[PDB]
Design a protein around this ligand. Structure first.
Ligand SMILES: Nc1ncnc2c1ncn2[C@@H]1O[C@H](COP(=O)(O)OP(=O)(O)OP(O)(O)=S)[C@@H](O)[C@H]1O
Ligand SMILES: Nc1ncnc2c1ncn2[C@@H]1O[C@H](COP(=O)(O)OP(=O)(O)OP(O)(O)=S)[C@@H](O)[C@H]1O
Lengths: 325, 272, 534, 325
């Protein structure tokens, strides 16, 4: 069946019938700073070559028009000394534009028109250099790759903790670098029909993450199983344990947000768990172990799971049995 | 183990045979190097007189070797005799409460093995250690004399070996004892299965015991495997250095002893 | 335009050495993934190292910097290719591999141009060998992209790094390291350094890989025994072990024979150097260095592979005879002692014989190459010398046998002594209550003298062994050199003979122990078959 | 025993068995912007020298191949005027690459191949200059050093405030520059066994910071003792005062987050207090004092402590005594 957002964190829902009013290009550089590296490098070299060829053509033409291009000895001084053909003119254009300044061909004080073309060439060169540096730097603050290094366990299990049904999922870090003030927004989607006859195709509802006195966020050093307790007030509380594996369509997504240390940008990661991915009545294997003088974490058992003799029943019926026991 | 145990072991032999062994070994190794030193001058060309001197050296070598071997034998036997007699006499005059305090295994075990072990292996291993160390010192002196400069290049590398020594022993000993331990409960386990075989086949406990024996043989193999891995490590690294030294020796010999030195009898001894 | 083609060759090495440095410096500033052709890649890289040494030799002979720079650049390029492949084995990528493939293609192009321009007109052989090696490495890279994901369709279907040797705490990772460290045991540096500080124990030690357990070796051995018994004994169990342990043993044996060949080869290049200077030598020196290191490395790898096959065999037959201990009948004291000796001495004999198995195949070729080589250096006289040394090998065996006999006798006496001690160290209070202790000590000393008497003959035989050990090397040179010149010599001849004499004395001693070990192992396997089939 | 995160703020837990899929290098510049200064300077000089030597080699070769390298008078004009050897060629490469443009050796309009090599040399030079500036600037927003200047007192004491047990810890600032919107996440870890037989090796739980009506964050001007009150609902409420000093293994960590003013990045600081570090029944000395016309803060008494006659008992037993008194 159709998934809401894919495991890799990319969004699945394909958009249709966007009334484009042009804002897609109106974000001129915040559009292309999104692109890949080959496309952005291609369009940067094309910017540079475009400008260089434009001014090389205009210079070729101005040297042709002054008549300094006509090879002649005396009665003149070329506006640009030692210019012969188009090739040397393009060499002059790249010599003055990108500010190498070879000086074999000298622009002279006889023609003020060449002064004007230089005084606009250089400023446009400097402006396009300034933007083509700022945008590549604004790019190198792409830290979604740091959204790649995070990992979640492939499937999530539920258990019985403290006499109440609980669901456990793992997270973890993959580098030394921490993520500041990460917060968890844990959401459930379902095609819902209201008592008013209103049917929604998809209905996001927050399920709380259960920490100390409150709080939406967590602290990530070692793999920490996130711990929620479904109660009669919770939206997930009504389902049955035998109807989840095959038929029902329930996506439980988690969105972890946080700002990486060194860049300072705020990244996040998104993952979905389907009704066929989740399973019932198990327990993860303890990862952390007291090694020689530290805590060793073994990621081989990250996705490992052991059987646990826990009663199998619906959370509504389990709450009724708790009322009975 | 300190030099005190070996000091007492060799002082039980006495001053009569200690020097008779040590100086004879030194002289045998000196003859074994001098024969090749004279062969070096033999090479370039009084060939008959040269060959006669070679024969004289060859005879001296074998006579001295026989003398040294007989010395080691006689000394080891005398030391074993005196040590056993002294141990017996000192155990005789002990108080009764001492005998009651110490278990029988330790008192009996020393005589059972220590004595046997020493008689079987100490003389041969001591002879081999002495021959090896003196041959190594002689070879270093040869490759130094052959190349005046090669000497100054070989003292760095040898110091390297010092660092390779420590890190080896402090592990090679350790692993060693571990092997012994994994050998002891294994065999014993076997015996326990043989006697109470009917009880074990009756309880149908064969599966758990087979599991235990797989566990024990794995614990034995891991030790006997790490030991051979460590021996291979030390071997390969010492060999890499032993090849570095011959590389440097030949590279110095080809230039120093041919271009400027103009001596060919040198490079032979050094390379060999 | 020779210099032009030399420069054209220098270029791609430079390209690769320049792209390697950013990535190498980021990587320099625990799952091992292996790719097909890894071992082939490292073998070919060592062959490249060798051919590059030869090219440097050519460049020395010719000299013109620009004419021998290509070798010095390909040297660093191959070392950096090794660094890249280490960086890829440690963390997999699809892009670094393409980064290697580009360089391989360009180097192949340059070598082809060199070959053509040479054909139109020593260099020829070296250039051809380099061409073949680069082509084979290219094919390896093409295989690697064909396997998983260089560009191929979407998902690699990548392996999922092997959990056998990489999952939950294991410390002895021999099968799961770089094929260079599989030879030079570099992975032991960490273990031995940690061992220096903290005392080793079974908690600080690893656990055996799935490649070598009781279950694995037992499985292979029982499969072979099943396939042999379904076609129906001593010969049967023998052939079963043979077919079960298969490729590893012969691999060790061939490592061993190649090492023996190179070891016989060393002294001849010594001889060549000695000749050249008395009348092309630096090349021989560096070749001697290379041949020494390679020969000894192959020898050591051979030892280790044989030892590991033997340990496998010991574990296997031990758990097998324990499996047999479950089904035996009660009618069969003496059998218990025979069983526990069947594990304490018979199994150790079997395993040590399996240690020495490849030596038994590699000894004859060693002595044959030795005798034929010394004959062509010293002529007919050599033959005479070649007899004397060989004559020490049977004599040694005889000596050994005498030792054994003596040992037996001595052991008997020793045992009795222990008995006469066990009483005294138990009736301690009884003994000292009337001071009859000296009376028993006299008897104990009486036993000791008999024990001492046996030990004299044993140590006499030990002395004869040690004496022959260093006497035969002297006697060979004596009766050979005196019997060559003054009967029937450049320094090279004499010193090569000396080297070969030592290189032949070292293996000779081992043949005697090998023969003893082999006959004892044959008897022990007959015993194991008689037991295992009751 | 083993510590969770070290006093300096670095993380202790060593990771084992990371299934590296290559994302560690896939973060190409967000990897090296983490590095120290010597390594980053080394790899930048190696980038620059690598590119310069590459193009110097190709130029040497092209001048050799055209035959302009063969010293000859007439019948030619070198593609690059006045080129003699490799050295002058490398001088030309560094002259055009890093845009000094000396002009003693002139590239000419006779060979378009030299035009191509220049038109790629310059663009690659400009791109690698752009990245090697953006990443060093993204580095100089390392404000972890500002995470260094914060300080916490070495050990934390508990007291009795308002008839209820309380724990007091100090914090403070070390510069004029403020930290915007700092928030406190105060966590306790312990090897815990659930009533379901589940044992966790380490169990992070939030203990609230007790401010006005609510709020997770604080305001840092002067050293402010953070004030929590453990109650029967709190997770720390069960321990005993004589069992903490030696045996028990309880790490109480605090994570203070906040964004520094001038850079705008969000930094944080992390510290641990062990069961042997914390002590019982004391009071800090008042730091702030009304000086001449201001408030003087003396950091000599920062870690000083005075004895206070307060009853010593367990928080559970103290709550039972409060029920009795
Ligand atoms: N199909 C579309 N795709 C994207 N944007 C849209 C689309 N339709 C409308 N919008 C914009 O988003 C807002 C949605 O309001 P509408 O659904 O269009 O109601 P509206 O009164 O018809 O407004 P209009 O279409 O501009 S006259 C509008 O203000 C549009 O600017
Ligand atoms: N040892 C590890 N180290 C780092 N990352 C891992 C490790 N194991 C898995 N991952 C990644 O993090 C997620 C954890 O899921 P897993 O425990 O691997 O379950 P899984 O079903 O076996 O998924 P796989 O291994 O990709 S087929 C996976 O999607 C992996 O991409």
């Amino acid at each position: 069946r159709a998934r809401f957002v894919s495991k890799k964190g990319n969004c699945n829902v394909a958009h249709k019938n966007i009334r484009e009013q042009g804002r897609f290009l109106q974000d001129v550089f915040t559009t292309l700073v999104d692109l890949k590296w080959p496309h952005t490098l291609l369009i940067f070299t094309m910017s540079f070559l475009c400008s260089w060829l434009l001014f090389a053509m205009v210079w070729w033409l101005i040297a042709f028009a002054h008549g300094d291009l006509a090879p002649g000895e005396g009665t003149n001084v070329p506006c640009v000394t030692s210019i012969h053909s188009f090739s040397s003119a393009f060499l002059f254009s790249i010599e003055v534009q990108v500010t190498i300044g070879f000086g074999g061909r000298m622009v002279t004080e006889e023609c003020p028109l060449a002064i004007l073309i230089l005084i606009v060439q250089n400023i446009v060169g400097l402006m396009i250099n300034a933007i083509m540096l700022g945008c590549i730097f604004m790019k190198t603050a792409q830290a979604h790759r740091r959204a790649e290094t995070l990992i979640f366990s492939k499937h999530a299990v539920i258990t019985l903790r403290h006499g109440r049904l609980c669901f456990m999922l793992r997270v973890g870090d993959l580098r030394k670098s921490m993520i500041i003030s990460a917060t968890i927004h844990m959401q459930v989607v379902r095609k819902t029909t209201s008592p008013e006859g209103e049917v929604v195709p998809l209905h996001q509802v927050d399920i709380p993450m259960e920490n100390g006195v409150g709080g939406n966020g967590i602290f990530l050093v070692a793999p920490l199983i996130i711990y929620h307790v479904i109660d009669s007030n919770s939206p997930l509380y009504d389902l049955a344990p035998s109807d989840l594996h095959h038929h029902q369509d329930l996506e439980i997504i988690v969105i972890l947000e946080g700002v990486v240390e060194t860049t300072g940008i705020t990244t996040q990661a998104r993952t979905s768990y389907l009704a066929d991915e989740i399973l019932w009545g198990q327990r993860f294997v303890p990862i952390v172990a007291e090694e020689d003088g530290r805590y060793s974490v073994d990621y081989s058992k990250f996705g490992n799971t052991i059987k646990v003799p826990t009663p199998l029943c619906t959370a509504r019926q389990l709450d009724e049995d708790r009322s009975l026991l | 183990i300190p030099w005190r145990a070996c000091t007492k072991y060799l002082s039980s032999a006495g001053i009569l045979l200690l020097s008779l062994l040590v100086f004879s070994q030194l002289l045998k190794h000196m003859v074994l190097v001098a024969i090749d030193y004279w062969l070096a001058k033999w090479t370039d060309s009084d060939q008959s007189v040269y060959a006669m001197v070679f024969t004289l050296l060859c005879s001296l070598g074998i006579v001295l070797c026989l003398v040294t071997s007989v010395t080691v034998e006689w000394t080891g036997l005398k030391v074993a005799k005196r040590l056993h007699r002294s141990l017996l006499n000192r155990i005789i005059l002990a108080p009764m409460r001492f005998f009651e305090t110490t278990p029988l295994g330790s008192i009996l075990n020393r005589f059972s093995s220590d004595c046997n072990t020493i008689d079987q292996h100490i003389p041969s291993t001591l002879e081999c250690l002495s021959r090896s160390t003196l041959l190594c010192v002689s070879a270093l002196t040869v490759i130094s004399y052959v190349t005046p400069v090669f000497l100054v290049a070989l003292l760095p590398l040898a110091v390297v070996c010092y660092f390779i020594q420590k890190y080896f022993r402090v592990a090679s000993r350790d692993l060693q004892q571990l092997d012994d331990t994994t050998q002891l409960p294994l065999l014993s386990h076997f015996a326990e299965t043989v006697e109470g075989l009917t009880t074990i086949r009756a309880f149908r406990y064969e599966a758990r015991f087979q599991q235990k024996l797989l566990e024990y043989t794995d614990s034995n193999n891991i030790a006997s495997l790490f030991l051979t891995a460590a021996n291979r490590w030390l071997e390969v690294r010492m060999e890499y250095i032993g090849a570095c030294v011959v590389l440097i020796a030949a590279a110095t010999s080809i230039s120093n002893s041919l271009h400027r030195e103009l001596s060919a009898g040198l490079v032979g001894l050094g390379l060999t | 335009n020779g210099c032009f083609v030399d420069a054209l060759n220098v270029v791609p090495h430079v390209f690769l050495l320049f792209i390697t440095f950013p990535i190498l410096f980021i990587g320099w500033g625990s799952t091992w993934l292996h790719f097909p052709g890894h071992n082939l890649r490292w073998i070919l890289t060592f062959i490249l190292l060798f051919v590059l040494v030869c090219e440097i030799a050519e460049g020395i002979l010719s000299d013109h910097l620009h004419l021998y720079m290509p070798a010095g650049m390909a040297f660093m390029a191959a070392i950096t290719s090794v660094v890249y492949y280490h960086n890829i084995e440690t963390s997999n990528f699809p892009k670094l591999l393409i980064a290697l493939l580009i360089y391989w293609t360009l180097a192949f192009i340059t070598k082809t141009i060199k070959f053509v321009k040479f054909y139109d007109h020593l260099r020829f052989c070296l250039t051809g060998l380099l061409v073949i090696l680069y082509g084979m490495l290219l094919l390896v890279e093409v295989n690697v992209i064909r396997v998983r994901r260089y560009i191929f369709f979407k998902t690699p279907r990548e392996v999922k790094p092997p959990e056998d040797l990489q999952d939950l705490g294991v410390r002895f990772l021999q099968p799961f390291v770089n094929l260079l460290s599989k030879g030079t045991y570099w992975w032991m540096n960490a273990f031995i350094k940690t061992a220096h500080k903290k005392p080793i124990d079974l908690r600080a030690i690893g656990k055996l890989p799935i490649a070598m357990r009781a279950l694995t070796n037992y499985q292979r051995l029982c499969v072979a025994f099943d396939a042999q018994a379904r076609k129906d004994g001593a010969r049967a169990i023998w052939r079963a072990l043979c077919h079960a342990f298969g490729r590893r043993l012969i691999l060790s044996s061939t490592f061993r024979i190649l090492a023996d060949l190179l070891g016989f080869a060393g002294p001849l290049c010594i001889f060549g150097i000695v000749d050249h200077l008395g009348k092309n030598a630096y090349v021989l020196a560096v070749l001697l260095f290379l041949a020494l290191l390679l020969q000894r490395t192959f020898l050591q790898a051979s030892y280790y592979v044989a030892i590991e096959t033997g340990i496998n065999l010991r574990g296997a037959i031990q758990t097998k005879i324990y499996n047999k201990i479950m089904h035996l009948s009660t009618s069969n004291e003496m059998t218990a002692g025979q069983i526990c000796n069947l594990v304490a001495i018979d199994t150790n004999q079997l395993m040590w014989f399996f240690f020495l198995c490849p030596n038994l195949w590699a000894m004859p070729v060693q002595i044959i190459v030795g005798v034929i080589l010394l004959y062509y250096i010293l002529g007919v006289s050599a033959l005479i010398g070649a007899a004397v040394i060989i004559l020490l090998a049977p004599v040694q065996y005889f000596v050994a046998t005498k030792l054994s006999q003596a040992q037996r006798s001595t052991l008997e006496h020793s045992n009795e002594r222990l008995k006469q001690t066990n009483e005294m160290l138990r009736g301690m209070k009884l003994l000292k209550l009337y001071a009859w202790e000296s009376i028993f000590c006299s008897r104990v000393e009486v036993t000791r003298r008999k024990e001492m008497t046996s030990l004299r003959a044993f140590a006499v035989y030990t002395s004869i062994s040690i004496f022959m050990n260093t006497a035969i090397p002297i006697a060979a040179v004596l009766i050979t050199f005196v019997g060559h010149v003054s009967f029937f010599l450049s320094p090279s001849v004499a010193f090569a003979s000396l080297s070969l004499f030592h290189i032949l004395v070292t293996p000779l001693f081992l043949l005697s122990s090998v023969v003893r070990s082999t006959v004892k192992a044959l008897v022990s396997v007959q015993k194991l078959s008689e037991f295992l089939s009751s």
